[PDB]
Amino acid sequence: SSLRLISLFTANSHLGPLQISLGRMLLDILKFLFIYCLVLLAFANGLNQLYFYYETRAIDEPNNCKGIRCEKQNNAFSTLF
Amino acid sequence: SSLRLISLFTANSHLGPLQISLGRMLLDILKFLFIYCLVLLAFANGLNQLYFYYETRAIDEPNNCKGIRCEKQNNAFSTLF
């Protein structure tokens, strides 16, 4: 609801021609996004297939924290998610 | 081999009558040894029977130390030994 004040820039002479030039840049990231998506799901598979034998539990870890976003990161290549 | 210099105390007049009085004290600890052994064998069983469900391993424990004599003692009532 707060990002809708950008449709008012067309009524000014300085900020007007800037939105039109920004509209074209967003037609260049699509193809690189496609290629990057393929390169990422390709690699997301081998690493998961190699490390899924050493998955521990939470109660056997310090402070009962499992995964990244803890203070000491652990169990980063266990599942596919 | 070094505790055999106590068999020479009988040739002196000060240390002589001390070995003979010490020889009698060692005939009082036997009965209390009997009672204490029964009282210890009695209690050594319930505590082992109550705690033998939560026995962890040694890779889950910090610094790979299991049992008493570590810096942080753990697994004290797991087995009978």
Side-chain angles (χ1 to χ4, degrees), chain A residues 57 60, chain B residues 56 60:
Chain A
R57 262 170 14 235
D60 313 311
Chain B
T56 77
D60 309 350

Side-chain angles (χ1 to χ4, degrees), chain B residues 2-80:
Chain B
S2 198
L3 265 77
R4 197 173 171 83
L5 274 72
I6 302 171
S7 158
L8 270 69
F9 280 9
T10 65
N12 196 0
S13 166
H14 299 268
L15 313 176
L18 209 64
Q19 185 170 352
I20 301 288
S21 201
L22 167 82
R24 299 326 172 223
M25 302 296 181
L26 295 180
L27 271 75
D28 281 311
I29 317 188
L30 266 296
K31 310 166 287 197
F32 292 89
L33 251 179
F34 209 113
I35 299 193
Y36 176 71
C37 291
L38 177 63
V39 173
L40 180 136
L41 263 295
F43 275 83
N45 186 26
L47 283 153
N48 167 49
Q49 181 153 350
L50 190 46
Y51 277 109
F52 83 110
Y53 286 163
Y54 313 89
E55 172 186 358
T56 77
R57 276 141 292 284
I59 233 173
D60 309 350
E61 307 280 2
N63 264 344
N64 262 27
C65 200
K66 179 186 177 189
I68 62 178
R69 300 207 297 262
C70 307
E71 180 147 8
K72 187 177 175 171
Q73 308 174 338
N74 57 338
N75 277 316
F77 298 126
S78 285
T79 80
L80 192 51

